[PDB]
Structure formats: C-alpha cells, structure tokens
Design a protein around this nucleic acid. Structure first.
Length: 306
RNA sequence: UUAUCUCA
C-alpha cells in the first residue's frame, strides 16, 4: 500500500515536478569548495551521542547556517492561508482536520561522559535524548538534503563528485519501481564502491543529514534522474500551492489515504502533507529548510470563510 | 519533542 500511494501521488503531481539535477550538483559543488568538512565530522559525532545538550544543538544550527549560505535550493518563510478558491469548502475541512491530526501525534539519568563506558560494557554482553532549554530550536534543523548528501559522500568517500552522482542515480532508478532496501544497497555496492559509505547498520533516527542513511541517499538519487516524476523534485509557490493540495486530496480520496496514529509509522500521505505545508515557497523535500521557523500546522492555516 | 531510521 505505501509504495502504491507513493506512485499514485507521483502520477497525479507529475506536472509540478521539475528537472533539478543541475542545481543539486551545482550546490554540491559549492559545499565541496566552501564548507568546513572538519566541523562536518564533529557535528556528525556530536549528533550520535545519546545525551545531547544545547552546546551540541548550537553546533548543529551553526553548521546548518553555513550550508544555507552556500546553496541556492532553499525554502523561505512563507505563511499560507487556505481559502475557498480552487479549493472546495469540503477540502478545507479535510485539510483543517488532517493538519490537526499531525499536530496531535506530536503532542535516562544525570551522567555523563561515562555513558561511553556504559555502552561498551553493555555491548560487552540506542535511545538518544535531548537536554535543551527550548525545544523549538530543534524544529527544522534535522532534515536531509540531496546536495549535502552528495557533498559528504564525495569528500568522506574520497571520490569524484561524478562517481557519487552515478551511484546515487542507480538508487534513483530502482526507486521508480520499489523502495530500495539494505540488500539492494549491498548488491549495488559491487559496481559502486562509494556506496560502502552508506552503512545501514550504523545509520539511525534523528541524527541529522550530516550522517549517512539509505533513505537520504535514495532522496538524493531521485533528483539525479531528469524524469520519473519524483515527488522529491516538486516545487511549491504561493500560486501553485492550492493546486498541489487539491491534487493530493484527489489521490487521498481515490486510494483512501490517511494520517496514521501509531507514533512510529510515517507514511507517504502525512509525509507530503507536512512537507508541503511547512512553507508556501520552496522545494518541500529537498531544499535547505534550516531557516524556517515553526511546524506545518503553524505555517499553514485554514480559513473557513466564506 | 527532531520531517527523520529501518521496513512491503
């Protein structure tokens, strides 16, 4: 069902998808030339600690800003108000409800640097927490960005930007047919040594786009084919915003898509919905969103008047 | 609490 939703969305939204290989590669080059890959290493590590504090968060956000400055594919703060227009009044009700659903789903001791030894000893025979003053500051700092994935694969893997691009393109083609997985990645590593860098055993949840993952690599590979009607390459603007939501609603109806309740499962529908509604101006899947403040349900509001 | 891990 998941991949079916994904594919129905792709076909429906194909008109809003664009060719962005060029930009993504241009942006990767910018990062390769301008970014401090020494600090990239540090932030990678800092993000992997189980106890993470404000000093680590500040480190992450600073790096994010550095990256925001080198890249052209950004999302900008753009509040959206949805009104009865190309959107029906029933549609506003669905959206207003589903945004609420998203909101609602969102609603271990004192040591130390000895957690490192706890780990080793435990292994001898990994939930990660934040200790932060204001947790708003985590919002939008943890996303994945193709141009960044490319850059890090390239410097850290010590290969040509091109070798990375070709490898990820293969992931991208597979992705048009199925959700690539660990075995597929392993079979692809023969022809593409660079993919050894994506270690799926060592990858994890909420550790930022500076660390590698199969999911992030697939997101990147999607931007490598100038076609495929990949959702990743969708651009949103204030004009095109309603048309996109309406097209999504049409698929939602047709396939009976919905927002899950189980906190762990995040599906094609809630993914595209949260991503679109975060800002009415950017590339919802693949841009630099570190500048954005707030969540989708705050940045997009429904207006039942009429 | 992080728009992210892994999975059909």
């Amino acid at each position: 069902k998941s991949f079916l939703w994904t594919q129905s969305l792709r076909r429906e939204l194909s008109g809003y998808c664009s060719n962005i290989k060029l930009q993504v590669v241009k942006d990767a080059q910018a990062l390769l030339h301008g970014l401090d890959f020494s600090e990239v290493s540090n932030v990678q590590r800092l993000m992997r600690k189980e106890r993470r504090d404000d000093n680590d968060l500040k480190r992450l956000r600073d790096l994010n800003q550095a990256v925001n400055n080198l890249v052209e594919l950004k999302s900008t703060q753009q509040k959206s108000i949805l009104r009865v227009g190309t959107l029906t009044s029933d549609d506003l009700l669905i959206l207003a409800a589903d945004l609420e659903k998203l909101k609602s789903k969102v609603i271990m001791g004192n040591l130390s640097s000895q957690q490192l030894d706890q780990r080793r000893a435990l292994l001898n025979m990994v939930v990660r927490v934040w200790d932060v003053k204001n947790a708003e500051l985590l919002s939008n700092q943890f996303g994945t960005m193709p141009s960044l994935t490319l850059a890090c694969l390239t410097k850290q893997g010590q290969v040509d930007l091109n070798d990375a691009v070709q490898a990820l393109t293969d992931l991208g083609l597979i992705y048009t047919a199925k959700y690539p997985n660990t075995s597929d990645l392993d079979r692809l590593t023969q022809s593409h040594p660079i993919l050894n860098m994506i270690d799926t055993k060592k990858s994890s949840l909420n550790i930022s786009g500076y660390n590698f993952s199969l999911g992030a690599a697939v997101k990147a590979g999607a931007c490598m084919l100038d076609g495929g009607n990949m959702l990743e390459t969708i651009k949103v603007s204030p004009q095109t915003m309603d048309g996109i939501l309406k097209s999504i609603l049409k698929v939602k109806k047709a396939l009976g898509m919905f927002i899950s309740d189980t906190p762990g499962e995040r599906n094609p529908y809630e993914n595209i919905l949260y991503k679109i509604c975060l800002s009415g101006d950017g590339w919802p899947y693949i841009a630099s969103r570190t500048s954005i403040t707030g969540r989708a349900w705050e940045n997009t509001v429904v207006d039942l008047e009429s």
